[PDB]
Coordinates of C-alpha atoms in Angstrom, one line a residue:
Chain A
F1 CA 7.8 1.6 6.4
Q2 CA 10.0 -1.3 7.5
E3 CA 13.4 0.2 8.2
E4 CA 15.1 -0.7 11.5
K5 CA 16.7 2.7 12.2
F6 CA 15.9 6.4 11.8
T7 CA 18.4 9.2 12.0
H8 CA 18.0 13.0 11.8
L9 CA 21.2 14.6 10.5
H10 CA 21.7 18.4 10.9
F11 CA 24.7 20.2 9.7
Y12 CA 26.0 23.2 7.6
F13 CA 27.4 23.0 4.1
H14 CA 30.1 25.6 3.2
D15 CA 30.9 26.5 -0.4
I16 CA 34.0 28.6 0.0
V17 CA 34.8 30.6 -3.1
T18 CA 36.8 33.5 -1.7
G19 CA 39.9 33.4 0.4
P20 CA 43.3 31.7 0.1
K21 CA 42.0 28.1 0.0
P22 CA 38.7 27.9 -1.8
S23 CA 36.7 24.6 -1.4
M24 CA 35.8 24.5 -5.1
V25 CA 37.2 24.9 -8.6
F26 CA 35.6 25.8 -11.9
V27 CA 35.5 22.7 -14.2
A28 CA 33.9 24.3 -17.2
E29 CA 32.6 27.8 -18.0
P30 CA 31.1 27.5 -21.5
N31 CA 29.3 30.8 -21.2
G32 CA 32.1 32.6 -19.3
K33 CA 31.4 34.7 -16.3
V34 CA 28.6 37.1 -15.3
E35 CA 28.2 39.3 -12.2
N36 CA 26.4 37.7 -9.3
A37 CA 25.6 34.4 -11.1
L38 CA 26.9 31.2 -12.7
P39 CA 25.9 31.1 -16.4
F40 CA 24.0 28.2 -17.8
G41 CA 26.3 25.2 -18.4
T42 CA 28.9 26.2 -15.7
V43 CA 30.3 23.2 -13.8
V44 CA 32.0 23.4 -10.4
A45 CA 33.7 20.7 -8.4
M46 CA 33.4 20.9 -4.6
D47 CA 35.2 19.5 -1.6
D48 CA 32.9 21.3 0.8
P49 CA 33.2 21.2 4.6
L50 CA 30.1 20.1 6.6
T51 CA 30.1 21.4 10.2
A52 CA 27.9 21.1 13.2
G53 CA 27.2 24.8 13.4
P54 CA 26.9 27.7 11.0
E55 CA 30.4 28.8 11.8
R56 CA 33.2 27.6 9.5
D57 CA 35.3 26.7 12.6
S58 CA 32.6 24.7 14.3
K59 CA 33.1 21.0 14.5
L60 CA 33.9 19.4 11.2
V61 CA 31.5 16.4 10.6
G62 CA 32.0 15.6 7.0
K63 CA 32.5 16.7 3.4
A64 CA 30.2 17.2 0.5
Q65 CA 32.1 16.1 -2.6
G66 CA 31.0 16.2 -6.2
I67 CA 29.9 18.7 -8.9
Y68 CA 27.2 21.3 -9.3
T69 CA 26.0 22.5 -12.7
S70 CA 24.1 25.6 -13.6
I71 CA 21.1 24.0 -15.4
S72 CA 18.6 26.9 -16.0
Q73 CA 18.7 29.4 -18.8
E74 CA 16.1 31.7 -17.0
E75 CA 17.4 31.9 -13.5
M76 CA 20.3 30.5 -11.6
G77 CA 19.5 26.9 -10.6
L78 CA 21.9 24.1 -9.8
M79 CA 22.0 20.3 -10.2
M80 CA 23.9 18.8 -7.3
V81 CA 25.6 15.4 -8.0
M82 CA 27.5 14.7 -4.9
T83 CA 28.1 12.5 -1.8
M84 CA 28.0 13.6 1.8
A85 CA 30.7 11.6 3.7
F86 CA 30.8 11.7 7.5
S87 CA 34.0 11.6 9.5
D88 CA 33.6 12.6 13.2
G89 CA 30.4 11.2 14.6
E90 CA 28.2 8.1 14.8
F91 CA 28.8 6.9 11.2
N92 CA 32.4 7.5 10.3
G93 CA 33.1 6.5 6.7
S94 CA 29.4 6.3 5.7
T95 CA 28.1 8.3 2.8
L96 CA 24.9 9.5 1.3
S97 CA 24.4 10.3 -2.4
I98 CA 22.4 13.2 -3.9
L99 CA 21.3 13.8 -7.5
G100 CA 19.0 16.7 -7.2
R101 CA 17.9 20.0 -8.5
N102 CA 18.6 23.0 -6.3
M103 CA 16.7 26.2 -7.2
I104 CA 18.7 28.5 -5.0
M105 CA 17.0 31.7 -6.3
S106 CA 13.3 30.7 -6.2
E107 CA 12.9 28.2 -3.4
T108 CA 13.7 29.0 0.3
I109 CA 13.5 25.3 1.4
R110 CA 14.9 23.0 -1.2
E111 CA 14.3 19.3 -1.1
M112 CA 16.7 16.7 -2.6
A113 CA 16.3 13.0 -2.6
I114 CA 18.8 10.7 -0.9
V115 CA 19.4 8.4 -3.9
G116 CA 21.8 6.0 -2.2
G117 CA 24.0 5.4 0.9
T118 CA 26.9 3.3 2.1
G119 CA 28.1 1.9 5.4
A120 CA 25.5 2.8 8.1
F121 CA 23.4 4.1 5.2
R122 CA 23.5 1.0 3.0
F123 CA 20.0 0.6 1.5
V124 CA 19.0 4.0 2.8
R125 CA 15.6 5.8 2.2
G126 CA 15.6 9.5 2.9
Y127 CA 15.4 13.1 1.9
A128 CA 17.3 16.3 2.5
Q129 CA 16.0 19.8 3.1
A130 CA 18.5 22.7 2.4
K131 CA 18.1 26.4 3.2
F132 CA 20.5 29.3 3.3
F133 CA 22.1 30.4 6.5
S134 CA 24.1 33.0 4.5
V135 CA 24.8 33.6 0.8
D136 CA 26.8 36.2 -1.0
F137 CA 25.9 36.1 -4.7
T138 CA 28.6 38.6 -5.7
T139 CA 31.3 36.0 -4.7
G140 CA 29.5 32.7 -4.4
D141 CA 30.3 32.2 -0.7
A142 CA 27.5 30.2 0.9
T143 CA 26.7 28.5 4.2
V144 CA 23.7 26.2 3.7
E145 CA 21.7 24.5 6.5
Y146 CA 20.9 20.9 5.9
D147 CA 18.4 18.6 7.6
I148 CA 18.5 15.0 6.4
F149 CA 16.0 12.4 7.4
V150 CA 17.2 8.9 6.7
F151 CA 15.7 5.4 7.3
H152 CA 18.3 2.6 7.3
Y153 CA 19.5 -0.7 8.9
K154 CA 21.8 -2.1 11.5
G155 CA 25.5 -2.0 10.5
Chain B
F1 CA 4.6 -3.7 -3.6
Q2 CA 3.5 -1.4 -0.7
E3 CA 3.2 2.2 -2.2
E4 CA 0.1 4.1 -1.7
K5 CA 0.0 5.8 -5.1
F6 CA 0.7 5.0 -8.7
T7 CA 1.1 7.6 -11.5
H8 CA 1.6 7.2 -15.2
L9 CA 3.4 10.2 -16.6
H10 CA 3.5 10.8 -20.4
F11 CA 5.2 13.7 -22.1
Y12 CA 7.7 14.7 -24.7
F13 CA 11.3 15.8 -24.2
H14 CA 12.8 18.4 -26.5
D15 CA 16.5 18.8 -27.1
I16 CA 16.7 22.0 -29.2
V17 CA 20.1 22.5 -30.8
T18 CA 19.1 24.6 -33.8
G19 CA 17.4 28.0 -33.8
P20 CA 17.9 31.3 -32.0
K21 CA 17.4 29.9 -28.5
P22 CA 18.8 26.4 -28.1
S23 CA 17.9 24.5 -25.0
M24 CA 21.4 23.2 -24.4
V25 CA 25.1 24.2 -24.4
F26 CA 28.3 22.3 -25.0
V27 CA 30.1 21.9 -21.7
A28 CA 33.2 20.0 -23.0
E29 CA 34.2 18.7 -26.4
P30 CA 37.5 16.9 -25.7
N31 CA 37.3 15.1 -29.1
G32 CA 36.0 18.1 -31.0
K33 CA 33.1 17.7 -33.5
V34 CA 32.1 15.0 -36.0
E35 CA 29.3 15.1 -38.5
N36 CA 26.0 13.5 -37.3
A37 CA 27.4 12.5 -33.8
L38 CA 28.8 13.6 -30.5
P39 CA 32.3 12.2 -30.0
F40 CA 33.2 10.2 -26.9
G41 CA 33.7 12.4 -23.9
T42 CA 31.4 15.2 -25.1
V43 CA 29.3 16.8 -22.3
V44 CA 26.2 18.9 -22.9
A45 CA 24.1 20.7 -20.3
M46 CA 20.3 20.9 -21.0
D47 CA 17.3 22.9 -19.9
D48 CA 14.9 21.0 -22.0
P49 CA 11.1 21.6 -22.3
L50 CA 8.7 18.8 -21.4
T51 CA 5.4 19.1 -23.2
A52 CA 2.1 17.3 -23.2
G53 CA 2.2 16.6 -27.0
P54 CA 4.9 16.0 -29.6
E55 CA 4.6 19.6 -30.7
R56 CA 7.0 22.1 -29.3
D57 CA 4.2 24.6 -28.6
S58 CA 1.9 22.0 -26.9
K59 CA 1.3 22.5 -23.2
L60 CA 4.6 22.9 -21.2
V61 CA 4.5 20.5 -18.3
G62 CA 8.1 20.6 -17.0
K63 CA 11.8 20.8 -17.7
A64 CA 14.5 18.1 -18.0
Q65 CA 17.6 19.7 -16.5
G66 CA 21.1 18.2 -16.2
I67 CA 23.9 16.9 -18.4
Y68 CA 24.3 14.2 -20.9
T69 CA 27.7 12.7 -21.8
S70 CA 28.8 10.7 -24.9
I71 CA 30.0 7.5 -23.2
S72 CA 30.7 5.0 -26.0
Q73 CA 33.7 4.8 -28.2
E74 CA 32.0 2.5 -30.7
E75 CA 28.6 4.1 -31.3
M76 CA 26.9 7.2 -30.0
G77 CA 25.5 6.4 -26.6
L78 CA 24.6 8.9 -23.8
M79 CA 24.6 8.9 -20.0
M80 CA 21.8 11.1 -18.7
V81 CA 22.3 12.7 -15.3
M82 CA 19.2 14.9 -14.9
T83 CA 16.1 15.8 -13.1
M84 CA 12.6 16.1 -14.5
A85 CA 10.8 18.9 -12.7
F86 CA 7.0 19.5 -13.2
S87 CA 5.4 22.8 -13.3
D88 CA 1.8 22.9 -14.7
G89 CA -0.1 19.8 -13.5
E90 CA -0.8 17.6 -10.5
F91 CA 2.6 17.8 -8.9
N92 CA 4.0 21.3 -9.3
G93 CA 7.5 21.6 -7.9
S94 CA 8.0 17.9 -7.7
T95 CA 11.0 16.2 -9.4
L96 CA 12.3 12.9 -10.5
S97 CA 16.0 12.0 -10.8
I98 CA 17.6 9.9 -13.6
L99 CA 21.1 8.5 -13.8
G100 CA 20.9 6.2 -16.8
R101 CA 22.4 5.0 -20.0
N102 CA 20.6 6.0 -23.2
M103 CA 21.7 4.0 -26.3
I104 CA 20.0 6.2 -28.8
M105 CA 21.5 4.5 -31.9
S106 CA 20.9 0.8 -31.0
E107 CA 17.8 0.6 -28.8
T108 CA 14.3 1.8 -29.9
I109 CA 12.8 1.7 -26.4
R110 CA 15.2 2.9 -23.8
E111 CA 14.7 2.2 -20.1
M112 CA 16.1 4.4 -17.4
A113 CA 15.6 4.0 -13.7
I114 CA 14.0 6.6 -11.5
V115 CA 16.8 6.9 -8.9
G116 CA 15.0 9.5 -6.6
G117 CA 12.1 11.9 -6.4
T118 CA 11.0 14.9 -4.4
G119 CA 7.7 16.4 -3.3
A120 CA 4.9 14.2 -4.5
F121 CA 7.7 11.8 -5.6
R122 CA 9.5 11.6 -2.3
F123 CA 10.6 8.0 -1.7
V124 CA 9.6 7.1 -5.3
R125 CA 10.1 3.8 -7.0
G126 CA 9.7 3.8 -10.8
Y127 CA 11.1 3.6 -14.3
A128 CA 11.1 5.5 -17.5
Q129 CA 10.8 4.3 -21.1
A130 CA 12.0 6.7 -23.8
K131 CA 11.6 6.4 -27.6
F132 CA 12.1 8.9 -30.4
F133 CA 9.2 10.8 -31.9
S134 CA 11.7 12.6 -34.2
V135 CA 15.4 13.0 -34.3
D136 CA 17.8 14.8 -36.7
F137 CA 21.3 13.5 -36.2
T138 CA 22.8 16.1 -38.5
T139 CA 21.8 18.8 -36.1
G140 CA 21.0 17.0 -32.8
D141 CA 17.4 18.3 -32.7
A142 CA 15.3 15.6 -31.0
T143 CA 11.8 15.1 -29.6
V144 CA 11.7 12.1 -27.3
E145 CA 8.5 10.4 -26.1
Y146 CA 8.6 9.5 -22.4
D147 CA 6.4 7.2 -20.4
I148 CA 7.3 7.1 -16.7
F149 CA 5.7 4.7 -14.2
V150 CA 6.1 5.8 -10.6
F151 CA 5.0 4.4 -7.2
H152 CA 4.9 6.9 -4.4
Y153 CA 3.1 8.2 -1.3
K154 CA 0.6 10.8 -0.1
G155 CA 2.0 14.4 0.0
Chain C
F1 CA 13.5 -7.9 2.7
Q2 CA 10.9 -8.7 0.1
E3 CA 12.7 -9.0 -3.2
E4 CA 12.1 -12.1 -5.3
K5 CA 15.6 -12.6 -6.6
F6 CA 19.2 -12.2 -5.4
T7 CA 22.3 -12.1 -7.6
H8 CA 26.0 -12.0 -6.8
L9 CA 27.9 -10.3 -9.6
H10 CA 31.7 -10.6 -9.7
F11 CA 33.8 -9.1 -12.5
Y12 CA 36.9 -6.9 -13.1
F13 CA 36.8 -3.2 -14.2
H14 CA 39.6 -2.0 -16.5
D15 CA 40.5 1.7 -16.8
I16 CA 42.9 1.6 -19.7
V17 CA 45.0 4.9 -19.9
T18 CA 48.1 3.7 -21.7
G19 CA 48.3 2.0 -25.1
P20 CA 47.0 2.7 -28.6
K21 CA 43.2 2.5 -27.7
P22 CA 42.6 4.0 -24.2
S23 CA 39.2 3.3 -22.7
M24 CA 38.9 6.9 -21.3
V25 CA 39.4 10.5 -22.2
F26 CA 40.0 13.6 -20.2
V27 CA 36.9 15.8 -20.2
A28 CA 38.4 18.7 -18.1
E29 CA 41.7 19.4 -16.4
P30 CA 41.1 22.7 -14.6
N31 CA 44.2 22.1 -12.5
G32 CA 46.4 20.7 -15.2
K33 CA 48.4 17.6 -14.7
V34 CA 50.5 16.3 -11.7
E35 CA 52.7 13.2 -11.5
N36 CA 51.0 10.1 -10.2
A37 CA 47.6 11.7 -9.6
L38 CA 44.6 13.5 -11.0
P39 CA 44.3 17.0 -9.6
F40 CA 41.1 18.2 -7.9
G41 CA 38.4 19.0 -10.4
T42 CA 39.7 16.7 -13.1
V43 CA 36.9 14.9 -15.0
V44 CA 37.4 11.7 -17.1
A45 CA 34.8 9.9 -19.3
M46 CA 35.2 6.1 -19.4
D47 CA 34.0 3.3 -21.6
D48 CA 35.6 0.6 -19.5
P49 CA 35.5 -3.1 -20.1
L50 CA 34.2 -5.5 -17.5
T51 CA 35.6 -9.0 -17.7
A52 CA 35.1 -12.3 -15.9
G53 CA 38.7 -12.5 -14.9
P54 CA 41.5 -10.1 -13.9
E55 CA 43.0 -10.5 -17.4
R56 CA 42.1 -7.9 -20.0
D57 CA 41.4 -10.7 -22.5
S58 CA 39.2 -12.8 -20.3
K59 CA 35.5 -13.0 -21.2
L60 CA 33.9 -9.5 -21.7
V61 CA 30.8 -9.3 -19.7
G62 CA 29.9 -5.6 -19.8
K63 CA 31.0 -2.0 -19.9
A64 CA 31.2 0.7 -17.1
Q65 CA 30.3 3.9 -18.8
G66 CA 30.1 7.4 -17.3
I67 CA 32.5 9.9 -15.7
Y68 CA 34.8 10.1 -12.7
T69 CA 35.8 13.3 -11.0
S70 CA 38.7 14.0 -8.7
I71 CA 36.8 15.5 -5.7
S72 CA 39.3 15.8 -2.9
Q73 CA 41.8 18.6 -2.3
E74 CA 43.9 16.6 0.2
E75 CA 44.3 13.2 -1.5
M76 CA 43.2 11.6 -4.7
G77 CA 39.6 10.5 -4.4
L78 CA 37.0 10.0 -7.1
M79 CA 33.3 10.4 -7.5
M80 CA 32.0 7.7 -9.9
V81 CA 28.8 8.6 -11.9
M82 CA 28.3 5.6 -14.2
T83 CA 26.3 2.7 -15.4
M84 CA 27.4 -0.9 -15.5
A85 CA 25.7 -2.5 -18.6
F86 CA 25.9 -6.3 -19.1
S87 CA 26.2 -7.9 -22.5
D88 CA 27.2 -11.6 -22.4
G89 CA 25.5 -13.4 -19.6
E90 CA 22.2 -13.8 -17.7
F91 CA 21.0 -10.2 -18.0
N92 CA 22.0 -8.9 -21.4
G93 CA 20.9 -5.3 -21.8
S94 CA 20.3 -4.7 -18.1
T95 CA 22.2 -2.0 -16.3
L96 CA 23.1 -0.8 -12.8
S97 CA 23.7 2.8 -11.8
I98 CA 26.3 4.1 -9.4
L99 CA 26.7 7.6 -7.8
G100 CA 29.4 7.0 -5.3
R101 CA 32.6 8.2 -3.7
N102 CA 35.7 6.1 -4.4
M103 CA 38.6 6.8 -2.0
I104 CA 41.2 4.9 -4.0
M105 CA 44.2 6.0 -1.9
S106 CA 42.8 5.5 1.6
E107 CA 40.3 2.6 1.5
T108 CA 41.2 -0.9 0.4
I109 CA 37.6 -2.1 0.1
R110 CA 35.4 0.6 -1.3
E111 CA 31.6 0.5 -1.0
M112 CA 29.3 2.2 -3.6
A113 CA 25.5 2.1 -3.5
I114 CA 23.5 0.7 -6.4
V115 CA 21.2 3.7 -6.9
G116 CA 19.1 2.2 -9.7
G117 CA 18.8 -0.6 -12.3
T118 CA 17.1 -1.5 -15.5
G119 CA 15.9 -4.6 -17.2
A120 CA 16.5 -7.5 -14.9
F121 CA 17.6 -4.9 -12.3
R122 CA 14.5 -2.7 -12.5
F123 CA 13.7 -1.6 -8.9
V124 CA 17.0 -3.0 -7.7
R125 CA 18.4 -2.8 -4.1
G126 CA 22.1 -3.5 -3.8
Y127 CA 25.6 -2.4 -3.1
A128 CA 29.1 -2.8 -4.7
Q129 CA 32.4 -3.5 -3.2
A130 CA 35.5 -2.6 -5.2
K131 CA 39.1 -3.4 -4.5
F132 CA 42.3 -3.2 -6.6
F133 CA 43.6 -6.1 -8.5
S134 CA 46.3 -3.9 -9.9
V135 CA 46.9 -0.2 -10.2
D136 CA 49.8 1.9 -11.7
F137 CA 49.4 5.5 -10.4
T138 CA 52.2 6.7 -12.7
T139 CA 50.0 6.0 -15.7
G140 CA 46.5 5.5 -14.3
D141 CA 46.1 2.0 -15.6
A142 CA 43.9 0.0 -13.2
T143 CA 42.2 -3.3 -12.9
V144 CA 39.5 -3.2 -10.2
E145 CA 37.8 -6.2 -8.7
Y146 CA 34.0 -5.8 -8.2
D147 CA 31.5 -7.8 -6.1
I148 CA 28.0 -6.5 -6.4
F149 CA 25.1 -7.9 -4.4
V150 CA 21.7 -7.1 -5.8
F151 CA 18.1 -7.8 -4.9
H152 CA 15.6 -7.6 -7.7
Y153 CA 12.5 -9.0 -9.3
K154 CA 11.3 -11.3 -12.1
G155 CA 11.8 -10.0 -15.6

């Protein structure tokens, strides 16, 4: 391929459901609630911290902001529609966009396309691989390890 | 163009509204219901079978999973935000992403960009053409013929 | 880069909240209403005119159709999930897709990736820059200047 730059991004995504300041909010629950899962059709909006380490209080490097939707009638699976926006590193203000299926119950390493980027990631080509560091299905709290491989151009 | 592989995909998308196990669910209906249409602002989540033939019981080849939104005040038109995920063929586990307008009342052949892909379709370039095989606007039941033309790389 | 065509698009986006025929509708308001802002998790569907000039009654060149979501807990910021569809110009029926963060309170020039296109914009590569012409946060009425730079191919 012809891109001028390659970058490996590695960080941890936190969906914080419990506690006094959750990172998300239910947008729609057309099938109500069920224990340990999000019923088909549930939509959640997220403002989720991205950190350098698995720990919530490790260095904040960005936010994953968007919505996820429960899109499977047979198991819990999510559609992620979101940006990853970076704020304390080598591409402050730059973003990556994701529109990807996320089969959190049946795939251990989950691939999502990078469908766009801005700033340093204008015209980006790339992909993301997500895997759990920790998940509690009774509450929804999750810490998700991301590796993103992006090919892009001079800023 | 420079891609190493080309694939023509051809299948049928089923939005099943009637019957004992619909494939979709209303997420939001801010303008209620109207006969034979989805009012502006309506959002539906889908877990829609993709089959090799027009018949519902023909070979299941994947699922179209995501949301569609009624986005026109003047006619019924949809925005599709979804993945197509393939499960019984040459690219099991691979997906394609669509973020496209879908003017089901005023275009007979409807083009939607492939905005991303995974697995076999990592780094994909392509487009989809959709046209009705059958539609019942009084219920919403629809069978939609898809041709997708994708350019991609070795797995 | 290798594209055969380049096009500079310039137009004005109107989100019309006040008046007898708003261009949008609230889809979900999980955190209710607040003065001068859209609370985190709010989703709006839009059928927004695109015009050649800042004036609402200047030449209609297309529609921006999709949803925007309030995705920040700390300031008002939007995720745009939408198509721009053109109707009275050099690419009638063609569309561009956007999946981008839109930090309307903290960035004066806001970049969004073009994540796909159709028709004349099949296989497009490009980006959008948005900046206010006018905004009234007490009502939500906004006129937004867009420049879009797209690289594409013969039709």
